[PDB]
């Protein structure tokens, strides 16, 4: 009831959220709240709770899970209470509620939640609860910020004569590596879980596993959108993502339409499976946007090389041939392609997703299907939108003008 | 380097590329139309999705969702 109270219409309400955070986290009413700690016992997670009779009890999380599996009522009830507590905590931290986020981060660290997530002996739903808590408390915070897959502002001298996928990654690899150190273990766990899910047939067969994979896919989508995945890792992950959707505590908060082309100037019964498929589709759309960015960079590099060579007459035919090479006719761009079958797997997945009952999933599938065959037109339009600046001061002027115009 | 010359060359290359790739875009759209014509061919014959596509499930769903 409290968890539903904090959030209304899937959007966090600041006032009631603040009141609930103050009341639950107040020094009083600590008996109701379960306490989680780490003990050397390497380290293990232990839960200590104060019973309504004022008799304190302590037990390891693994012991509680084993007892619940054996069918003991007390441990199962304690675990369910802990899950509802975790859901309430996650609702408290929704929409970057710093007041409660700070205290909850002090109470629960990244390592503890990662250990709980990676402890498969614990129940699947409990692991999903820790996945949700990790996504909201830690991954979504002040240091993390959204990224733009396509940048229409380029600097003439910074543009390399030749660009490669390795160079494209290395462009931002320093920042990505320095920011990914905290969540590197989480990324590895997510990748391992996705590989395990895709390896098994009929991945969406167990409801608890369905919830866990939905949480994992949400975490992966968040991390990708904050820019914590390199381009190469994204191309490696897209194959697995297509494999999962290969033909054989839920909040539906929607951000800016994922299925939107870059621009220079700006309740189903099985709804869990449909939502994870939709998240996978959003990830695939983001990957396609990064591919478009790489193609634009390649075109810009070719143009700059030709201009510098000609002007220390331009061979437009060679430029046209090079720009045609990327579109997938040749094997040079086979790396860019997100499918190993030449797009047959992607097209089949889109067709199998287009007739699903869920409406947002069908809309996304149709938009992706239409975007698939417009690679050339989209690339040309994106290149036309691109602007080149030879001075860094010009870049700063463009940035300030863009900010002012967007705000106005 | 000259900014005006760079801009002029950028416009020239953009125009040349735009003129060059129109028939390829038209061919891609035609291939999309052809694929939409026979959606089942992509799927395996024994698959139920193939049967639905052959009977018009895909196109019927598209028509229903368009409105």
UniProtKB/Swiss-Prot annotation, chain B:
It comes from the Eukaryota. Phosphorylated by AKT1 on serine and/or threonine residues. Inositol 1,4,5-trisphosphate-gated calcium channel that, upon 1D-myo-inositol 1,4,5-trisphosphate binding, transports calcium from the endoplasmic reticulum lumen to cytoplasm, thus releasing the intracellular calcium and therefore participates in cellular calcium ion homeostasis. This is Inositol 1,4,5-trisphosphate-gated calcium channel ITPR3. Composed of a large N-terminal cytoplasmic domain (CD) followed by a juxtamembrane domain (JD) and a transmembrane domain (TMD). It is found in: Endoplasmic reticulum membrane; Cytoplasmic vesicle, Secretory vesicle membrane. Belongs to the InsP3 receptor family. It is linked to Charcot-Marie-Tooth disease, demyelinating, type 1J: An autosomal dominant demyelinating form of Charcot-Marie-Tooth disease, a disorder of the peripheral nervous system, characterized by progressive weakness and atrophy, initially of the peroneal muscles and later of the distal muscles of the arms. Charcot-Marie-Tooth disease is classified in two main groups on the basis of electrophysiologic properties and histopathology: primary peripheral demyelinating neuropathies (designated CMT1 when they are dominantly inherited) and primary peripheral axonal neuropathies (CMT2). Expressed in intestinal crypt and villus epithelial cells. Homotetramer. Homodimer. Interacts with TRPC1, TRPC3 and TRPC4. Interacts with TRPV4. Interacts with SIGMAR1. Interacts with PML and AKT1. Interacts with IRAG2 (via coiled-coil domain). Interacts with CABP1. Interacts with TMBIM4/LFG4. Interacts with CEMIP. Interacts with TESPA1. Interacts with TMEM203. Interacts with BOK; regulates ITPR3 expression. Interacts with BCL2L10. Interacts with CHGA and CHGB.
